Design a binder for this molecule. Structure first.
Ligand SMILES: *C(=O)[C@H]([C@@H](C)O)[C@H]1CC(SCCNC=N)=C(C(=O)O)N1
Length: 357
């Protein structure tokens, strides 16, 4: 029930007024929006996780988050770094000996953590196993030297997560589901959704409005494997702002914070470890203009800041996700949808909601 002067109702009015038209105009079946401010959390669910038979979005609905998954690979690499197992400045072939003598002698772990190796966006469809992947990587050359340009890459994020996990002595899937997500308290976050949660796994709806789930291919866990709830992602946002006890895991807090280090500038955007940031306050135009480019190194790296807007978009064929948070304001938003709608609208709605707080 609505109550004037009560936090949850004031925020709900703002969120409803933006999300209901957004869902109508884009024919988005279902969304969940989670907001944190002043140490308090608010979760709003809209519409349908599935159309036939109908299932509503609930607190337990799982959405695919696409390239938001890359921030977990970065957090894992950062955890390995702060634990003394990984140096970001070292070469990929230092950690992957089969690539020694290849172009990966000249690509750093930082490059694959910042989209500056030059590897292309999509894994080639005919690469099915590790032998084929290594043969491809050993024979690969970019047109420009590593460190010169920013090219968003699922392959690069794959290498980042693989190297981080190996440096901890485990597979990536183990590192994420047995180490990282449990230490973050994200108990409804998965690379593979278990049987008791399938009833909660929303269907995605593609451009033709067909129900779809993402197909997991080689190195896909690193780049697009996460399925999660808005509540778990809001915990992740709070952890990224140092707000949670985190079971006294000092190394994990340091790992999260260190992913916000600013390593390259492209246009107006600062590239962190997978996260992207802009100075705060942000104007909507610069946010929108932010969504190969020349990459200029920031050296020494920009330390993790408070006065910034940190964000990440992610999509799959059937889903569209967005996170933004402002550490100086201890505020953040997670928007999950089971339809891939345009990034300009994600950032505009998030900006309007956070501005209202
Ligand atoms: C991620 O959503 C897909 C991946 C699952 O194939 C692609 C498309 C995007 S493009 C850059 C988004 N800009 C700012 N946040 C990426 C990605 O790395 O974000 N990979």
């Amino acid at each position: 029930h609505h109550h004037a002067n009560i936090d949850e109702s004031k925020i709900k009015d703002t969120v409803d007024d933006l999300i209901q038209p957004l869902m109508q105009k884009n024919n988005i079946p279902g969304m969940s929006v989670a907001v944190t401010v002043n140490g308090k959390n608010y979760i709003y669910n809209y519409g349908l996780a599935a159309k036939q038979p109908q299932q509503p979005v609930t607190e337990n609905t799982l959405f695919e988050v696409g390239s938001l998954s890359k921030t977990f690979a970065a957090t894992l690499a950062s955890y390995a770094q702060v634990s003394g197992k990984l140096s970001l400045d070292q070469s990929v072939s230092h950690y992957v000996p089969e690539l020694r003598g290849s172009s990966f002698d000249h690509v750093s772990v930082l490059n694959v953590g910042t989209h500056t190796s030059g590897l292309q966006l999509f894994m080639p469809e005919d690469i099915k196993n590790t032998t084929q992947l290594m043969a491809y990587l050993k024979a690969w050359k970019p047109a420009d030297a590593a460190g010169t340009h920013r090219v968003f890459s699922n392959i690069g994020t794959g290498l980042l997560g693989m190297i981080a996990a190996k440096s901890l002595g485990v597979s990536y899937e183990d590192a994420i589901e047995k180490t990282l997500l449990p230490q973050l308290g994200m108990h409804h976050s998965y690379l593979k959704v278990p049987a008791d949660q399938m009833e909660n796994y929303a269907w995605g709806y593609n451009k033709k409005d067909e129900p779809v789930h993402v197909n997991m291919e080689i190195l896909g866990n690193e780049a697009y494997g996460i399925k999660t709830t808005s509540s778990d992602l809001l915990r992740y946002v709070q952890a990224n702002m140092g707000q949670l006890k985190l079971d006294a895991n000092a190394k994990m807090q340091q790992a999260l914070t260190a992913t916000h280090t600013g390593y390259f500038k492209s246009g107006e955007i600062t590239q962190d470890l997978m996260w992207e940031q802009l100075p705060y306050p942000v104007s909507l135009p610069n946010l929108l203009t932010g969504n190969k480019s020349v990459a200029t190194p920031i050296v020494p790296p920009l330390p993790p800041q408070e006065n910034v807007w940190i964000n990440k978009t992610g999509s799959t064929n059937g889903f569209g996700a967005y996170i933004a948070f402002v550490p100086a304001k201890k505020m953040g938003i997670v928007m999950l949808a089971n339809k891939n709608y345009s990034i300009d609208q994600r950032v505009t709605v998030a900006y309007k909601i956070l501005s209202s707080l």
